[PDB]
Amino acid sequence: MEIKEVDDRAELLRYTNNIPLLGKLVNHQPLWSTNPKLKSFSLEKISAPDQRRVQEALVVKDLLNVLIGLEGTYIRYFNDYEPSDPETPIEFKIAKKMDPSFKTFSRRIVRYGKQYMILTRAYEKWSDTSFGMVLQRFAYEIRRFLEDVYLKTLVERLERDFNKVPNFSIRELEQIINETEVNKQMELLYNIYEEIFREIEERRTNQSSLHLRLMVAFDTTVYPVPKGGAILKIFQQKILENLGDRSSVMFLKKLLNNISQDYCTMLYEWLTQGILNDPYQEFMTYDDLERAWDTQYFIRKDVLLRDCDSEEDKNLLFKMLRTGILLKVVRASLQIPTIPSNSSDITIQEINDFADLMEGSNLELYVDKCYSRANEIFLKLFFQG
Amino acid sequence: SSVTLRQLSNPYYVNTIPEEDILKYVSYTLLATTSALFPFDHEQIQIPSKIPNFESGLLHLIFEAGLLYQSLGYKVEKFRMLNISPMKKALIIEISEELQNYTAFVNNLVSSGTVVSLKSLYREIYENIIRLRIYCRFTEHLEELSGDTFLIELNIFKSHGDLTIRKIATNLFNSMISLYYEYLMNWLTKGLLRATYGEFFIAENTDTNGTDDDFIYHIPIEFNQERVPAFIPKELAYKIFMIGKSYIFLEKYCKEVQWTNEFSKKYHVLYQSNSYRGISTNFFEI
């Protein structure tokens, strides 16, 4: 109701070389929490117990605000927050002077908002090229979960009810949040993000022929950030950890299917043409030329789906490498960049449901069917041609 | 107590604008058009008093779109009056089409009248916010550098894990590589170097050391190894350079007019028939 004569102005930001590709380019709003404007009212004037409903009505406004990531009037940002800081933490004060109905349940929603903020910033932080494609594709998915499920449901529905329903209740607020089960989904994304951060901090922390006749050697090197094999391992681990929640299972399955489309394209294309095309250097192995006769190949163990410690996963990996090399030499000798489909009888398909293939009992079946294809065509090559 | 809570709350806030008129003003300004509450000074917005912090932040979030619109408009108006590379105006025309599409989408939203509150406007355009944002970030240095720099950058971006960035980069890349395909055709079919303005890796050398090295002992065409974009294999680049030098050598001194012309027309048809593949294996075969 008052005026604080604050020059609130909107203008784009001057610096461009430190804000990621999707980073927002508008100046941050003016800091009500320390630079107040136009009202500083303490509800102690209206802290009468009968006014309790009236009080929460005001409260409702502010809470219906924070969930979109913008702080409410009767919510102050903590002295820690600094808008020019991209990595500042998220914490903020709400007055205990009101009835607990103000404060108790609100803590649940604001956490949502807290994570709603970090995800958004993550939605930006992972947009950089050096983070490889998988998270980058993952970036897309997180955005959708906000602008098609969180907002279009919650914001639309909540505003409609607060404008139409006679005295909509915060209890009904919780009931409609969970009746659309969004919170659990958002929590799954949250915890996956926490594990990603854990792996990043681990890698930022500690910087420091006999039988199969393969002309191969390990290249064990660590990069500051996790890559696709790590991410897929992670999703497998989480789905394993939460067997039983049918909705959780279906959601995570859709995630796995959605993220690795062209990754599966790359793997299938290599197993059926021996051609490796990884402009981000995320695939399992990589070639020389960092003449093409000693085509020595190296394992980047840091991106493999398995510890490759026992005999069976080593067997799988080595069959993979051999199959690729065989098809590659076939192409090199016949002077054709592509292998026609109808050269043989064993026909192979793409990994249309990577979710179950990752579990086991089908991974090796696919691998050794491709191995059979490779052996038959290769032997026909050096026996007839 | 069968009453409306927002009605229980609104007259408590006495000195603020009816949110309906807030919508009224935001719809005009969304295209960075000044009006009663928000006079753009062509560079910023003055948000007046009687506006809660909430409304200020949301107006920040929304008006990002108008700021981007104005900046991109300045870019477009600034370059349509200049003399620059053809790929540059390829970027200009694509950005202009994007701006027109944004105009159409915004005014269609205004006409159909599905806007009811600020957050609705937020969710409706957030995608177009991102689209404008990416379009802005991709051209931060249009004024200084050359196009083939952008060709390489866009080629790299074609594999970006984002679907939206996928589509945008592919479109821009396709248009410029069609024009660059025209450059390559011109070199392979006539051996000229006209109107390339330093975006092509095969250069002509007018030099004074050895004043007769354009008369007898030399052919002043030069392959600069470092200037080949990543979508062309190096050995095929050598092949291309030798093809052009071959054509020059036959035409200028050998005088193989009939053979060179018939060969040229045949291969002219052969490439011009495949322009819809761009850069691909078939082209390498020819």
Numbering used by the authors:
A (entry chain D): 1 to 208, 225 to 306, 318 to 412
B (entry chain C): 163 to 448
Give passages from the manuscript.
Microtubule (MT) nucleation is regulated by the γ-tubulin ring complex (γTuRC), conserved from yeast to humans. In budding yeast, homologues of the grip-containing proteins (GCPs) GCP2 and GCP3 (Spc97p and Spc98p) and two copies of γ–tubulin (Tub4p) form a 300 kDa complex (γTuSC). Spc110p, a distant pericentrin homologue, recruits this complex to the nuclear face of the spindle pole body (SPB), while Spc72p recruits it to the cytoplasmic face.
To better resolve fundamental questions about the molecular basis for γTuRC assembly and activation, we determined the cryo-EM structure of unassembled γTuSC, without Spc110p or filament formation, from images of frozen-hydrated single particles. At the concentration of ~1 µM used in data collection, micrographs and 2D classes show a mixture of γTuSC monomers and dimers, with a small number of larger oligomers. We were able to obtain a structure of the γTuSC monomer at ~3.7 Å, and of a γTuSC dimer at ~4.5 Å resolution. In order to assess the changes that occur during assembly of monomeric γTuSCs into the γTuRC and the subsequent closure, we aligned the N-terminal two helical bundles of Spc97p and Spc98p (residues Spc97p52-276 and Spc98p178-342). During the transition from monomer to assembled open state (as seen in γTuRCWT), the γ-tubulins move in the same overall direction, approximately orthogonal to the plane of the Spc97p/Spc98p contact interface.
